[PDB]
PDB file of C-alpha atoms and ligand atoms in Angstrom:
ATOM      1  CA  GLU U   1     -17.699  13.781  13.003  1.00  0.00           C
ATOM      2  CA  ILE U   2     -15.245  12.341  10.401  1.00  0.00           C
ATOM      3  CA  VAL U   3     -14.846   8.468  10.504  1.00  0.00           C
ATOM      4  CA  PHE U   4     -11.651   7.271   9.029  1.00  0.00           C
ATOM      5  CA  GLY U   5     -10.776   3.717   8.225  1.00  0.00           C
ATOM      6  CA  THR U   6      -7.211   2.623   7.777  1.00  0.00           C
ATOM      7  CA  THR U   7      -5.131  -0.501   7.906  1.00  0.00           C
ATOM      8  CA  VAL U   8      -3.341  -1.085  11.384  1.00  0.00           C
ATOM      9  CA  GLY U   9      -0.288   0.546  12.040  1.00  0.00           C
ATOM     10  CA  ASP U  10       1.301   3.529  10.258  1.00  0.00           C
ATOM     11  CA  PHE U  11      -1.659   4.973   8.660  1.00  0.00           C
ATOM     12  CA  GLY U  12      -3.698   4.963  11.883  1.00  0.00           C
ATOM     13  CA  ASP U  13      -0.822   6.295  13.753  1.00  0.00           C
ATOM     14  CA  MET U  14      -0.814   9.375  11.353  1.00  0.00           C
ATOM     15  CA  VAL U  15      -4.459  10.202  12.244  1.00  0.00           C
ATOM     16  CA  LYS U  16      -4.082   9.621  15.864  1.00  0.00           C
ATOM     17  CA  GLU U  17      -0.640  11.367  16.129  1.00  0.00           C
ATOM     18  CA  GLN U  18      -1.334  14.496  13.942  1.00  0.00           C
ATOM     19  CA  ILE U  19      -4.291  14.791  11.668  1.00  0.00           C
ATOM     20  CA  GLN U  20      -6.917  14.292  14.560  1.00  0.00           C
ATOM     21  CA  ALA U  21      -5.705  17.206  16.418  1.00  0.00           C
ATOM     22  CA  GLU U  22      -5.508  19.428  13.266  1.00  0.00           C
ATOM     23  CA  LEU U  23      -9.215  18.717  12.542  1.00  0.00           C
ATOM     24  CA  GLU U  24     -10.298  19.184  16.220  1.00  0.00           C
ATOM     25  CA  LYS U  25      -8.932  22.603  16.011  1.00  0.00           C
ATOM     26  CA  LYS U  26     -11.585  23.319  13.317  1.00  0.00           C
ATOM     27  CA  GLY U  27     -14.326  21.780  15.300  1.00  0.00           C
ATOM     28  CA  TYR U  28     -14.549  18.298  13.956  1.00  0.00           C
ATOM     29  CA  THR U  29     -14.556  15.186  15.984  1.00  0.00           C
ATOM     30  CA  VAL U  30     -12.693  12.015  14.568  1.00  0.00           C
ATOM     31  CA  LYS U  31     -13.160   8.302  14.844  1.00  0.00           C
ATOM     32  CA  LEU U  32     -10.555   5.913  13.637  1.00  0.00           C
ATOM     33  CA  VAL U  33     -11.616   2.400  12.519  1.00  0.00           C
ATOM     34  CA  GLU U  34      -8.692  -0.015  11.799  1.00  0.00           C
ATOM     35  CA  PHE U  35      -8.644  -3.023   9.407  1.00  0.00           C
ATOM     36  CA  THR U  36      -6.248  -5.891   9.145  1.00  0.00           C
ATOM     37  CA  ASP U  37      -7.360  -6.693   5.519  1.00  0.00           C
ATOM     38  CA  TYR U  38      -7.734  -5.049   2.111  1.00  0.00           C
ATOM     39  CA  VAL U  39     -11.202  -6.210   1.244  1.00  0.00           C
ATOM     40  CA  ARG U  40     -13.403  -4.563   3.876  1.00  0.00           C
ATOM     41  CA  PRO U  41     -12.336  -0.872   3.815  1.00  0.00           C
ATOM     42  CA  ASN U  42     -13.678   0.107   0.501  1.00  0.00           C
ATOM     43  CA  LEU U  43     -17.004  -1.783   1.233  1.00  0.00           C
ATOM     44  CA  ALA U  44     -17.308  -0.012   4.768  1.00  0.00           C
ATOM     45  CA  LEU U  45     -16.602   3.339   2.818  1.00  0.00           C
ATOM     46  CA  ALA U  46     -19.289   2.610  -0.004  1.00  0.00           C
ATOM     47  CA  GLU U  47     -21.895   1.515   2.709  1.00  0.00           C
ATOM     48  CA  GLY U  48     -21.414   4.622   4.582  1.00  0.00           C
ATOM     49  CA  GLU U  49     -19.653   3.103   7.746  1.00  0.00           C
ATOM     50  CA  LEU U  50     -16.652   5.251   6.825  1.00  0.00           C
ATOM     51  CA  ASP U  51     -16.417   8.612   5.555  1.00  0.00           C
ATOM     52  CA  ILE U  52     -12.775   8.313   4.127  1.00  0.00           C
ATOM     53  CA  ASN U  53     -10.105   5.478   4.004  1.00  0.00           C
ATOM     54  CA  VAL U  54      -6.413   5.537   3.857  1.00  0.00           C
ATOM     55  CA  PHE U  55      -4.916   2.226   2.952  1.00  0.00           C
ATOM     56  CA  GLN U  56      -4.651   1.545  -0.883  1.00  0.00           C
ATOM     57  CA  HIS U  57      -2.823   2.535  -3.894  1.00  0.00           C
ATOM     58  CA  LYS U  58      -4.741   3.563  -7.089  1.00  0.00           C
ATOM     59  CA  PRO U  59      -4.152   0.659  -9.064  1.00  0.00           C
ATOM     60  CA  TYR U  60      -5.767  -1.362  -6.312  1.00  0.00           C
ATOM     61  CA  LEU U  61      -8.511   1.015  -5.933  1.00  0.00           C
ATOM     62  CA  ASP U  62      -9.256   1.506  -9.749  1.00  0.00           C
ATOM     63  CA  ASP U  63      -9.669  -2.407  -9.903  1.00  0.00           C
ATOM     64  CA  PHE U  64     -11.506  -2.951  -6.662  1.00  0.00           C
ATOM     65  CA  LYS U  65     -14.147  -0.190  -7.463  1.00  0.00           C
ATOM     66  CA  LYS U  66     -14.755  -1.418 -11.013  1.00  0.00           C
ATOM     67  CA  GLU U  67     -15.143  -5.061  -9.959  1.00  0.00           C
ATOM     68  CA  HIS U  68     -17.516  -4.510  -7.034  1.00  0.00           C
ATOM     69  CA  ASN U  69     -19.438  -1.329  -8.485  1.00  0.00           C
ATOM     70  CA  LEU U  70     -18.396   1.070  -5.700  1.00  0.00           C
ATOM     71  CA  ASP U  71     -18.942   4.843  -6.430  1.00  0.00           C
ATOM     72  CA  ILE U  72     -15.723   6.029  -4.660  1.00  0.00           C
ATOM     73  CA  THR U  73     -12.775   7.836  -5.607  1.00  0.00           C
ATOM     74  CA  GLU U  74      -9.373   8.809  -4.613  1.00  0.00           C
ATOM     75  CA  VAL U  75      -8.560  12.283  -3.070  1.00  0.00           C
ATOM     76  CA  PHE U  76      -5.008  12.838  -1.955  1.00  0.00           C
ATOM     77  CA  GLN U  77      -1.690  10.777  -1.523  1.00  0.00           C
ATOM     78  CA  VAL U  78      -0.106   9.938   1.723  1.00  0.00           C
ATOM     79  CA  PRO U  79       3.310   9.049   2.847  1.00  0.00           C
ATOM     80  CA  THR U  80       3.663   5.304   2.063  1.00  0.00           C
ATOM     81  CA  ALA U  81       5.865   2.424   3.173  1.00  0.00           C
ATOM     82  CA  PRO U  82       7.341   0.841   0.039  1.00  0.00           C
ATOM     83  CA  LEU U  83       7.069  -2.711  -1.146  1.00  0.00           C
ATOM     84  CA  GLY U  84      10.244  -4.832  -0.516  1.00  0.00           C
ATOM     85  CA  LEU U  85      11.641  -8.263  -1.049  1.00  0.00           C
ATOM     86  CA  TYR U  86      12.719  -9.513   2.205  1.00  0.00           C
ATOM     87  CA  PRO U  87      14.985 -12.428   3.435  1.00  0.00           C
ATOM     88  CA  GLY U  88      13.183 -15.765   4.355  1.00  0.00           C
ATOM     89  CA  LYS U  89      15.038 -18.882   4.349  1.00  0.00           C
ATOM     90  CA  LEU U  90      17.704 -17.430   1.988  1.00  0.00           C
ATOM     91  CA  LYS U  91      19.517 -14.202   3.232  1.00  0.00           C
ATOM     92  CA  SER U  92      20.764 -12.496   0.187  1.00  0.00           C
ATOM     93  CA  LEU U  93      19.982 -11.953  -3.442  1.00  0.00           C
ATOM     94  CA  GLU U  94      22.997 -13.835  -4.696  1.00  0.00           C
ATOM     95  CA  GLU U  95      21.716 -17.030  -2.904  1.00  0.00           C
ATOM     96  CA  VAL U  96      18.681 -17.309  -5.334  1.00  0.00           C
ATOM     97  CA  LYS U  97      18.745 -20.876  -6.818  1.00  0.00           C
ATOM     98  CA  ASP U  98      16.817 -22.530  -9.643  1.00  0.00           C
ATOM     99  CA  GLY U  99      13.432 -23.173  -8.301  1.00  0.00           C
ATOM    100  CA  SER U 100      13.665 -20.776  -5.346  1.00  0.00           C
ATOM    101  CA  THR U 101      10.374 -19.847  -3.668  1.00  0.00           C
ATOM    102  CA  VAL U 102       9.103 -16.443  -3.415  1.00  0.00           C
ATOM    103  CA  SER U 103       5.889 -15.510  -1.560  1.00  0.00           C
ATOM    104  CA  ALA U 104       3.545 -12.714  -3.150  1.00  0.00           C
ATOM    105  CA  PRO U 105       0.320 -11.261  -2.392  1.00  0.00           C
ATOM    106  CA  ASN U 106      -2.517 -13.009  -4.151  1.00  0.00           C
ATOM    107  CA  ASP U 107      -4.612  -9.869  -5.129  1.00  0.00           C
ATOM    108  CA  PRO U 108      -3.898  -8.878  -8.920  1.00  0.00           C
ATOM    109  CA  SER U 109      -2.811  -5.192  -8.628  1.00  0.00           C
ATOM    110  CA  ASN U 110      -0.299  -6.138  -6.024  1.00  0.00           C
ATOM    111  CA  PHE U 111       0.746  -9.312  -7.746  1.00  0.00           C
ATOM    112  CA  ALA U 112       1.762  -7.353 -10.826  1.00  0.00           C
ATOM    113  CA  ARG U 113       4.202  -5.279  -8.533  1.00  0.00           C
ATOM    114  CA  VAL U 114       5.994  -8.743  -7.716  1.00  0.00           C
ATOM    115  CA  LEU U 115       6.265  -9.727 -11.205  1.00  0.00           C
ATOM    116  CA  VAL U 116       7.864  -6.339 -12.217  1.00  0.00           C
ATOM    117  CA  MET U 117      10.166  -6.627  -9.267  1.00  0.00           C
ATOM    118  CA  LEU U 118      11.201 -10.146 -10.293  1.00  0.00           C
ATOM    119  CA  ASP U 119      11.927  -8.863 -13.915  1.00  0.00           C
ATOM    120  CA  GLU U 120      13.982  -5.992 -12.365  1.00  0.00           C
ATOM    121  CA  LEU U 121      15.963  -8.531 -10.632  1.00  0.00           C
ATOM    122  CA  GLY U 122      16.487 -10.715 -13.487  1.00  0.00           C
ATOM    123  CA  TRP U 123      14.838 -13.813 -11.991  1.00  0.00           C
ATOM    124  CA  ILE U 124      12.033 -13.824 -14.747  1.00  0.00           C
ATOM    125  CA  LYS U 125      11.608 -11.888 -18.017  1.00  0.00           C
ATOM    126  CA  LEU U 126       8.393 -10.256 -18.823  1.00  0.00           C
ATOM    127  CA  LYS U 127       7.224  -9.707 -22.465  1.00  0.00           C
ATOM    128  CA  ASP U 128       7.913  -6.324 -24.185  1.00  0.00           C
ATOM    129  CA  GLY U 129       5.265  -3.654 -24.187  1.00  0.00           C
ATOM    130  CA  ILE U 130       2.947  -4.861 -21.379  1.00  0.00           C
ATOM    131  CA  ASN U 131       1.103  -2.714 -18.935  1.00  0.00           C
ATOM    132  CA  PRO U 132       3.069  -2.907 -15.722  1.00  0.00           C
ATOM    133  CA  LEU U 133       0.023  -2.177 -13.572  1.00  0.00           C
ATOM    134  CA  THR U 134      -1.632  -5.348 -14.737  1.00  0.00           C
ATOM    135  CA  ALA U 135       1.286  -7.756 -15.132  1.00  0.00           C
ATOM    136  CA  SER U 136       0.194 -11.389 -14.824  1.00  0.00           C
ATOM    137  CA  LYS U 137       1.400 -14.751 -15.235  1.00  0.00           C
ATOM    138  CA  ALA U 138       0.388 -14.633 -18.927  1.00  0.00           C
ATOM    139  CA  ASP U 139       2.979 -11.775 -19.420  1.00  0.00           C
ATOM    140  CA  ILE U 140       6.032 -13.805 -18.469  1.00  0.00           C
ATOM    141  CA  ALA U 141       8.138 -14.408 -21.464  1.00  0.00           C
ATOM    142  CA  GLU U 142      10.506 -16.611 -19.664  1.00  0.00           C
ATOM    143  CA  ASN U 143      10.777 -17.949 -16.009  1.00  0.00           C
ATOM    144  CA  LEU U 144      14.348 -17.562 -16.050  1.00  0.00           C
ATOM    145  CA  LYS U 145      15.304 -18.927 -12.577  1.00  0.00           C
ATOM    146  CA  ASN U 146      12.138 -21.243 -12.501  1.00  0.00           C
ATOM    147  CA  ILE U 147      11.100 -19.224  -9.578  1.00  0.00           C
ATOM    148  CA  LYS U 148       8.078 -20.683  -7.821  1.00  0.00           C
ATOM    149  CA  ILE U 149       5.728 -17.801  -6.771  1.00  0.00           C
ATOM    150  CA  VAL U 150       3.753 -18.824  -3.563  1.00  0.00           C
ATOM    151  CA  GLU U 151       0.689 -16.601  -3.732  1.00  0.00           C
ATOM    152  CA  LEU U 152      -0.842 -15.560  -0.196  1.00  0.00           C
ATOM    153  CA  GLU U 153      -3.385 -13.302   1.332  1.00  0.00           C
ATOM    154  CA  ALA U 154      -1.294 -10.184   1.911  1.00  0.00           C
ATOM    155  CA  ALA U 155      -1.399 -10.141   5.693  1.00  0.00           C
ATOM    156  CA  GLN U 156       0.058 -13.548   5.841  1.00  0.00           C
ATOM    157  CA  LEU U 157       3.387 -12.421   3.886  1.00  0.00           C
ATOM    158  CA  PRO U 158       5.376 -11.630   6.995  1.00  0.00           C
ATOM    159  CA  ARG U 159       4.738 -15.084   8.729  1.00  0.00           C
ATOM    160  CA  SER U 160       5.717 -16.826   5.265  1.00  0.00           C
ATOM    161  CA  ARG U 161       9.382 -15.980   5.708  1.00  0.00           C
ATOM    162  CA  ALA U 162       9.763 -19.343   7.780  1.00  0.00           C
ATOM    163  CA  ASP U 163       8.412 -21.205   4.683  1.00  0.00           C
ATOM    164  CA  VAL U 164       9.771 -19.615   1.529  1.00  0.00           C
ATOM    165  CA  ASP U 165      13.274 -18.336   0.352  1.00  0.00           C
ATOM    166  CA  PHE U 166      12.259 -14.958  -0.116  1.00  0.00           C
ATOM    167  CA  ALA U 167       9.084 -12.864   0.894  1.00  0.00           C
ATOM    168  CA  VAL U 168       7.661  -9.834  -1.060  1.00  0.00           C
ATOM    169  CA  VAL U 169       5.870  -7.960   1.728  1.00  0.00           C
ATOM    170  CA  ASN U 170       3.621  -4.896   1.621  1.00  0.00           C
ATOM    171  CA  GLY U 171       4.955  -2.002   3.508  1.00  0.00           C
ATOM    172  CA  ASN U 172       2.057  -1.747   5.846  1.00  0.00           C
ATOM    173  CA  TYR U 173       2.340  -5.219   6.962  1.00  0.00           C
ATOM    174  CA  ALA U 174       6.150  -5.203   7.246  1.00  0.00           C
ATOM    175  CA  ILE U 175       6.041  -2.111   9.593  1.00  0.00           C
ATOM    176  CA  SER U 176       3.207  -3.658  11.661  1.00  0.00           C
ATOM    177  CA  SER U 177       5.109  -7.106  11.915  1.00  0.00           C
ATOM    178  CA  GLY U 178       8.242  -5.389  13.152  1.00  0.00           C
ATOM    179  CA  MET U 179      10.104  -5.751   9.876  1.00  0.00           C
ATOM    180  CA  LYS U 180      12.182  -2.721   8.879  1.00  0.00           C
ATOM    181  CA  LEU U 181      12.414  -1.210   5.638  1.00  0.00           C
ATOM    182  CA  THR U 182      16.169  -1.229   5.632  1.00  0.00           C
ATOM    183  CA  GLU U 183      15.974  -4.924   5.951  1.00  0.00           C
ATOM    184  CA  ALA U 184      14.782  -5.494   2.531  1.00  0.00           C
ATOM    185  CA  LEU U 185      17.033  -7.010  -0.012  1.00  0.00           C
ATOM    186  CA  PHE U 186      15.493  -5.004  -2.782  1.00  0.00           C
ATOM    187  CA  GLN U 187      12.944  -2.238  -2.687  1.00  0.00           C
ATOM    188  CA  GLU U 188      10.488  -1.462  -5.353  1.00  0.00           C
ATOM    189  CA  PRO U 189      11.773   1.595  -7.374  1.00  0.00           C
ATOM    190  CA  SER U 190       8.226   2.735  -8.678  1.00  0.00           C
ATOM    191  CA  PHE U 191       6.289   5.646  -7.283  1.00  0.00           C
ATOM    192  CA  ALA U 192       3.045   4.555  -8.831  1.00  0.00           C
ATOM    193  CA  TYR U 193       1.930   2.855  -5.555  1.00  0.00           C
ATOM    194  CA  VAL U 194       2.121   5.795  -3.401  1.00  0.00           C
ATOM    195  CA  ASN U 195      -1.139   5.326  -1.465  1.00  0.00           C
ATOM    196  CA  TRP U 196      -4.249   7.564  -1.707  1.00  0.00           C
ATOM    197  CA  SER U 197      -7.240   8.420   0.508  1.00  0.00           C
ATOM    198  CA  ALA U 198     -10.633   7.474  -0.990  1.00  0.00           C
ATOM    199  CA  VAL U 199     -14.234   8.799  -0.248  1.00  0.00           C
ATOM    200  CA  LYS U 200     -17.640   8.250  -1.716  1.00  0.00           C
ATOM    201  CA  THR U 201     -18.006  10.518  -4.916  1.00  0.00           C
ATOM    202  CA  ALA U 202     -20.878  12.319  -3.588  1.00  0.00           C
ATOM    203  CA  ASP U 203     -18.566  13.613  -0.691  1.00  0.00           C
ATOM    204  CA  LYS U 204     -15.792  14.873  -3.035  1.00  0.00           C
ATOM    205  CA  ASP U 205     -16.751  18.499  -2.811  1.00  0.00           C
ATOM    206  CA  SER U 206     -17.602  18.599   0.916  1.00  0.00           C
ATOM    207  CA  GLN U 207     -16.005  21.188   3.152  1.00  0.00           C
ATOM    208  CA  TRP U 208     -14.794  18.556   5.667  1.00  0.00           C
ATOM    209  CA  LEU U 209     -13.005  16.793   3.001  1.00  0.00           C
ATOM    210  CA  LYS U 210     -11.286  20.038   2.051  1.00  0.00           C
ATOM    211  CA  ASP U 211     -10.165  20.405   5.672  1.00  0.00           C
ATOM    212  CA  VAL U 212      -8.919  16.713   5.649  1.00  0.00           C
ATOM    213  CA  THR U 213      -6.887  17.349   2.715  1.00  0.00           C
ATOM    214  CA  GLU U 214      -5.494  20.492   4.051  1.00  0.00           C
ATOM    215  CA  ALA U 215      -4.437  18.545   7.232  1.00  0.00           C
ATOM    216  CA  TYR U 216      -2.677  15.982   5.173  1.00  0.00           C
ATOM    217  CA  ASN U 217      -0.893  18.777   3.260  1.00  0.00           C
ATOM    218  CA  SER U 218       0.160  21.133   5.972  1.00  0.00           C
ATOM    219  CA  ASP U 219       3.761  22.162   6.852  1.00  0.00           C
ATOM    220  CA  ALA U 220       3.369  20.511  10.144  1.00  0.00           C
ATOM    221  CA  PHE U 221       2.195  17.110   8.780  1.00  0.00           C
ATOM    222  CA  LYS U 222       4.950  17.077   6.380  1.00  0.00           C
ATOM    223  CA  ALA U 223       7.520  17.821   9.258  1.00  0.00           C
ATOM    224  CA  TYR U 224       6.021  15.006  11.230  1.00  0.00           C
ATOM    225  CA  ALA U 225       5.941  12.619   8.284  1.00  0.00           C
ATOM    226  CA  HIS U 226       9.604  13.181   7.437  1.00  0.00           C
ATOM    227  CA  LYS U 227      10.688  12.235  11.069  1.00  0.00           C
ATOM    228  CA  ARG U 228       8.096   9.608  11.794  1.00  0.00           C
ATOM    229  CA  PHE U 229       8.153   7.826   8.640  1.00  0.00           C
ATOM    230  CA  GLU U 230      11.816   7.825   7.428  1.00  0.00           C
ATOM    231  CA  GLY U 231      12.151   5.960   4.131  1.00  0.00           C
ATOM    232  CA  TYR U 232       8.531   6.347   3.002  1.00  0.00           C
ATOM    233  CA  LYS U 233       7.615   7.526  -0.437  1.00  0.00           C
ATOM    234  CA  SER U 234       6.066  11.078  -0.487  1.00  0.00           C
ATOM    235  CA  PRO U 235       2.907  12.410  -2.398  1.00  0.00           C
ATOM    236  CA  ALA U 236       3.830  13.397  -5.941  1.00  0.00           C
ATOM    237  CA  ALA U 237       2.324  16.732  -5.033  1.00  0.00           C
ATOM    238  CA  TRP U 238       4.748  17.503  -2.280  1.00  0.00           C
ATOM    239  CA  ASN U 239       7.198  18.004  -5.138  1.00  0.00           C
ATOM    240  CA  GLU U 240      10.129  16.723  -3.190  1.00  0.00           C
TER     241      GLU U 240
HETATM  242  C1  LIG F 301      -4.357  -2.297  -0.694  1.00  0.00           C
HETATM  243  S1  LIG F 301      -3.301  -1.942  -1.802  1.00  0.00           S
HETATM  244  C2  LIG F 301      -1.678  -2.507  -1.089  1.00  0.00           C
HETATM  245  C3  LIG F 301      -1.529  -1.631   0.451  1.00  0.00           C
HETATM  246  C4  LIG F 301      -0.523  -0.361   0.200  1.00  0.00           C
HETATM  247  N1  LIG F 301      -0.420   0.015   1.494  1.00  0.00           N
HETATM  248  C5  LIG F 301       0.666  -0.786  -0.299  1.00  0.00           C
HETATM  249  O1  LIG F 301       1.230   0.350  -0.991  1.00  0.00           O
HETATM  250  O2  LIG F 301       1.373  -1.683  -0.671  1.00  0.00           O
END
């Protein structure tokens, strides 16, 4: 029995609609546990409540496992809903004003993504030569449009659109709140945040993980993903 943990929505649908049957064909049973937050899944994995989770990108994982002393590691990538800047009280990028508010996730690896996006938009200017994966407020050279960044817990970002001019929303929460990726005013161009599964390091060589990895890389899964998850960013290894 393989116990998966995912965030609600797209990553759990992948298990229930495609992966689970592929693994049952090989004699496994599958249990899915879903989470509404980003903090519990790696802790449940490390404590043995999960065998594998699918919810995070590698910058998040690298930071989280180091901070909390978790002996876990990434395995394979999965199709991922991209990060986007979405309309809030203002409906178009050209409407940005001096002092416009932008809501952003408050954890460091996802906050960096917002600063890189704001620099790409020309709303702020980051210093030269920084590490984009750890971009922080100290790396801002000039806040060109005096953007006020409103930092929130990531799950709160869809609801923040009533309170801020623009909202930068993680794809999993955008999808699960009924937002459409095509409604974004600007989508992150990077592929560094295509999400990874994670397991306890002790399990990296297990036969069950080999079978899970094959399930997420099958022709059938790719065909399903391309239809069910249009506009998602693909694993690098799919070589699309
Ligand atoms: C926990 S890392 C952030 C969530 C991830 N699904 C993303 O690519 O936005």
